[PDB]
Amino acid sequence: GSQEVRRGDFVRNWQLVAAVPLFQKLGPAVLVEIVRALRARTVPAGAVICRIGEPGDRMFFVVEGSVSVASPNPSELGPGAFFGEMALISGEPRSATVSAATTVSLLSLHSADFQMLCSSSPEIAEIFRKTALERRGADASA
Numbered sequence: 001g002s003q004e005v006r007r008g009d010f011v012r013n014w015q016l017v018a019a020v021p022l023f024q025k026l027g028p029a030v031l032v033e034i035v036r037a038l039r040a041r042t043v044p045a046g047a048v049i050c051r052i053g054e055p056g057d058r059m060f061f062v063v064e065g066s067v068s069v070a071s072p073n074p075s076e077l078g079p080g081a082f083f084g085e086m087a088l089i090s091g092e093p094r095s096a097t098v099s100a101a102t103t104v105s106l107l108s109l110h111s112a113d114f115q116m117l118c119s120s121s122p123e124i125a126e127i128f129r130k131t132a133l134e135r136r137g138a139d140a141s142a
């Protein structure tokens with residue numbers, strides 16, 4: 001039932017959040033609120049996490065393992081990194097396909113909770129906005 005899902009979605013979250021530097025940036029009530037909303041997920045190596053052109057309704061914090069980003073300047077994102085923010089900020093479709101490189105643990109943040117986070121923390125909202133710009137900049141360069 002729903003109770004099992006709620007426990008499964010949370011049971012790992014606090015342990016894993018220590019691996020997200022972005023959230024060292026948060027007041028404690030804000031961090032706890034966000035951690036309750038996060039959902040921890042493990043994705044097997046090779047599996048697609050988000051696909052270019054599809055709608056985006058969440059973003060992801062990498063907490064164990066790594067992902068591969070298929071862009072003009074391909075990159076790997078490991079613990080502490082994040083992806084999926086661009087679609088949440090622009091309302092546009094996913095701009096690149098991201099796949100598990102090794103088996104990867106992620107903390108998933110749904111759009112509503114991303115908006116609450118950004119409305120709560122100007123520092124963090126700006127980090128997301130600048131990260132999206134950086135990534136667009138990387139894409140623009142051969």
Ligand SMILES: Nc1nc2c(ncn2[C@@H]2O[C@@H]3COP(=O)(O)O[C@H]3[C@H]2O)c(=O)[nH]1
Binds near residue numbers: 050056071075139
């Ligand atoms: N377009 C692009 N996305 C990147 C890059 N590096 C990491 N990503 C992430 O891959 C994500 C794909 O989905 P989004 O467009 O929502 O957000 C994207 C970024 O968070 C990059 O160089 N270019």
Ligand code: NA
Binds near residue numbers: 005009039
């Ligand atoms: Na769920």
